[PDB]
Ligand binder design. Structure first.
Ligand SMILES: CCOC(=O)[C@H]1CCCC[C@H](NC(=O)/C=C/c2cc(Cl)ccc2-n2cnnn2)c2nc(c[nH]2)-c2ccc(NC(=O)OC)cc2N1
Lengths: 6, 238
């Protein structure tokens, strides 16, 4: 994904 | 889900079933895995929910019958509801569940990509609403996860359909003009998943509608692209 979640 | 069909196992691996144990254990809402300790769902699901201790998140589920007392689930550490939320019909219908432990990713459970800010102008033509909700207004929770392909509706057309409501750009609508396919009771909080350039994106969160699958009454979803900064604020907090 372009939008990244840690 | 009205007018849908049975999903196959592993088809929507970000789909979760959120259960409450109070007063007895039952399906409460749908949700989506967006991070290894994060579920995105609807704020209205927590009406009267006084504590995250009564919540159980089940992932990798096709059939509700897979859930018994010995079935593993994720506990919820925290419920984060958008500050501006009052009710589903006024928008900001979004919440995050911070899980007590991390989800181990695999072919049965993995995250769905959030929409990109640049993809606010992309036209999605392959959108699906999923859930264990009713097949009509007076029904019951379904055993098998259902799916229905539904077209996105412009904000202008959705506003014409909901006279007396204020349909904002923080909402996204989906439905056929003649009705027939839609989310229904028990589907809320679940995803509106759209495939673009071979990648699935979480475009909407099932929120509300006037009845289910009625002609000229599209389903109303939280427009996830408009909340990407809010999601990152809450999940990427230092
Ligand atoms: C456990 C308590 O849960 C609840 O009170 C609500 C909370 C959540 C309350 C709202 C929720 N709204 C939806 O899900 C979707 C609405 C909706 C969305 C779109 Cl896009 C279009 C049309 C829609 N509809 C208009 N009218 N109906 N739908 C709902 N959910 C329920 C009853 N209403 C429920 C029903 C059954 C169970 N569970 C069990 O029967 O388990 C055996 C849980 C529910 N969820």
């Amino acid at each position: 994904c372009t939008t990244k979640i840690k | 889900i009205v007018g849908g069909t049975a999903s196959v196992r592993g088809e929507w691996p970000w789909q979760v079933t959120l259960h409450t144990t109070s007063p007895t254990q039952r399906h409460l809402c749908g949700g989506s895995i967006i991070g290894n300790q994060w579920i995105l769902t609807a704020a209205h699901c927590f009406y009267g929910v006084e504590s995250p201790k009564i919540l159980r998140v089940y992932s990798g589920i096709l059939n509700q019958s897979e859930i018994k007392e010995d079935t593993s689930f994720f506990g919820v550490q925290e419920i984060i509801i958008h500050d501006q939320y009052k009710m589903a019909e006024s928008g900001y219908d979004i919440a995050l569940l911070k899980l007590e432990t991390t989800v181990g990713y695999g072919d049965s459970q993995r995250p769905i990509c959030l929409p990109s800010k640049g993809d606010r102008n992309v036209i999605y033509t392959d959108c699906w609403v999923t859930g264990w909700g009713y097949r009509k207004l007076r029904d019951k929770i379904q055993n098998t996860l259902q799916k229905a392909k539904i077209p996105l509706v412009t904000n202008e057309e959705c506003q014409k359909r909901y006279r007396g409501h204020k349909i904002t750009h923080k909402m996204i609508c989906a439905g056929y003009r003649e009705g027939g396919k839609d989310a229904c009771k028990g589907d809320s909080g679940g995803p509106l998943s759209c495939k673009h350039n071979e990648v699935w994106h979480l475009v909407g969160i099932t929120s509300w509608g006037e009845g289910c699958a009625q002609r000229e009454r599209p389903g109303v979803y939280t427009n996830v692209v408009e909340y990407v900064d809010w999601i990152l604020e809450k999940t990427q907090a230092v």
